[PDB]
């Protein structure tokens, strides 16, 4: 009855709360290929600093 | 007064709280009662939710009140643990949280019992007591797992004063291991140490095992007075002092000890023996210095 | 009064929220698994940029 309708907001709630972490975890997983785009830079220019040897 | 937390598995818990006591207190009580951290819960009274900088008073919350707390999938803050194997492990840890928090965290998630872990963060391994903050272990840090198999253990090392450290060994591992262990992690030449465990001495020709030894046990250091080779050096204004040396010591080291002696710093030290200039390079070994055998000094 | 229409209508909502929290859970923790694997190729490219360094370093 009543105990219906506490435990679909409860669940409305928490299905919002999972949707944010998810959200969350995907806006990390966009800045660590932003990080992981930096080290590929990093080891082309490495890599041309190599060159630079003989 | 108390109030009640259901979860939606219902998991009824009581807090004793007072009205005029803020949300995040509340959420520091479930952290204290059933190990839940604040960023990882979310409060709901009736239907809205409970803000860190909002008290209970301002949410007409009674006596006997009940609460819903939802647990989220994550936290602030998640660290990345490596084994030797090869698996990528997520952690939800917080600042605070020590290293005996990581290790009992990834026992929950692997089942490797804390006893067999040692973890490895940009080349210095982590100590029990120490937290994430100490060690400066930002988010999405990797830390490297390593097993200390064959009897691993942590044993301490006090001396009469309180300087604790921490050395890895196995019951096979003999006292002299130990001593050596000691002089590669602070610096003490073990002819100087004399180790006591029990309020025995421990001989050198033993094993920890032989002392019945075993892991989180402290052992007492004492540091003698003197070692086995001692030298004599004559300082510009002619008084003599005796450095308690090694003959595989390096100039570098015994200058290193002129400079404690004496306080004169190494670059204006230039040593002498028998007619002889002595090289930082070489040894005292590769000079045939033998024990008290004086130098001088003169720039 | 129709008490059984919003009985069974609240049924349905219960199970299919049921459901939706299963689904976002298994979406998380597929994201999770991504991430893991990004932050192992991001710790690849950290060995390779430590060892380019390591070569240039020999350079005097």
């Known amino acids: ?54 | 007064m108390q109030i009640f937390v259901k979860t939606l598995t219902g998991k009824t818990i009581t807090l004793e709280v007072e009205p005029s006591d803020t949300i995040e207190n509340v959420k520091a009580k479930i952290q204290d009662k059933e190990g839940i951290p604040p960023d990882q819960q979310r409060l709901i009274f009736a239907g809205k939710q409970l803000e860190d900088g909002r008290t209970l008073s301002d949410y007409n919350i009674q006596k006997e009140s009940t609460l819903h707390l939802v647990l989220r999938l994550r936290g602030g803050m998640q660290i990345f643990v490596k084994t030797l194997t090869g698996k990528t492990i997520t952690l939800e840890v917080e600042p605070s949280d020590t290293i005996e928090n990581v290790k009992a965290k990834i026992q929950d998630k692997e089942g490797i019992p804390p006893d067999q872990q040692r973890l490895i963060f940009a080349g210095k391994q982590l100590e029990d007591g120490r937290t994430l903050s100490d060690y400066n272990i930002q988010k999405e840090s990797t830390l490297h797992l390593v097993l200390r198999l064959r009897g691993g253990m942590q044993i301490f090392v006090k001396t009469l004063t309180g300087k604790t450290i921490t050395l890895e060994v196995e019951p096979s591992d003999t006292i002299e291991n130990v001593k050596a262990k000691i002089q590669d992690k602070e610096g003490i030449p073990p002819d100087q140490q004399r180790l006591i465990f029990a309020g025995k001495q421990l001989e050198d020709g033993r094993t920890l095992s032989d002392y019945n030894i075993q892991k989180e046990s402290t052992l007492h250091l004492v540091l003698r007075l003197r070692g086995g080779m001692q030298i004599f050096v004559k300082t510009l204004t002619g008084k003599t002092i005796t450095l308690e040396v090694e003959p595989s010591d390096t100039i570098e080291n015994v200058k290193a000890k002129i400079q404690d002696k004496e306080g004169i710093p190494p670059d204006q030290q230039r040593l002498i023996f028998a007619g002889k200039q002595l090289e930082d390079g070489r040894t005292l070994s590769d000079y045939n210095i033998q024990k008290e055998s004086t130098l001088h000094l003169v720039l």
Do not use: C, G, P, W
Request: charged fraction near 45%; glycine fraction near 0%.
């Open chain 1, 1 to 54: 009855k009543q105990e219906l309708v506490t435990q679909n907001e409860l669940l409305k709630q928490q299905v919002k709360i999972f949707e944010e972490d998810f959200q969350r975890e995907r806006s990390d997983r966009e800045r660590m290929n932003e990080e992981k785009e930096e080290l590929k830079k990093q080891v082309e220019k490495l890599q041309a600093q190599v060159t630079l040897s003989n």
